[PDB]
Write a protein that binds this ligand. Structure first.
Ligand SMILES: [Cu+]
Length: 128
């Protein structure tokens, strides 16, 4: 099983994948995020945040109101399953989480919580 994925967030406010499949055989899953853009994190910062599809809107809404210093995430938000830090041009960050934090039959979404970015920077994640 392929238990990791490399993802990029760029200056065009786009991730380079719209869907991630996590194989059930995997015990852990790793996301390696990078920023090939030129813009700094205060204007084009990107993070990779995971939640159920149902909780996405709440996480995004409260994240925006949280500010840059809080990585645009509501402190201790229980709806966030896993997340990388917010990164800007030339930076990279990885996050590894336990696959047992996911279940079959539930739709998950990964997205960036920087203000306005989730309109384009989002995708599905599914355990199969
Ligand atoms: Cu972003």
């Amino acid at each position: 099983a392929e238990c990791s994925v490399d993802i990029q967030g760029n200056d065009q406010m786009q991730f380079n994948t719209n869907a991630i499949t996590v194989d059930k055989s995997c015990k852990q899953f790793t996301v390696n995020l990078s920023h090939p853009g030129n813009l700094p994190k205060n204007v084009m910062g990107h993070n990779w945040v995971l939640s159920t599809a149902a909780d996405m809107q709440g996480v995004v809404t409260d994240g925006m109101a949280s500010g840059l210093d809080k990585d645009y995430l509501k402190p201790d938000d229980s709806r966030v399953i896993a997340h990388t830090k917010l990164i800007g041009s030339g930076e990279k960050d990885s996050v590894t989480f336990d696959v047992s934090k996911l279940k079959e039959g539930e739709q998950y979404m990964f997205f960036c919580t920087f203000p306005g970015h989730s309109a384009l920077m989002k995708g599905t994640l599914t355990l199969k």
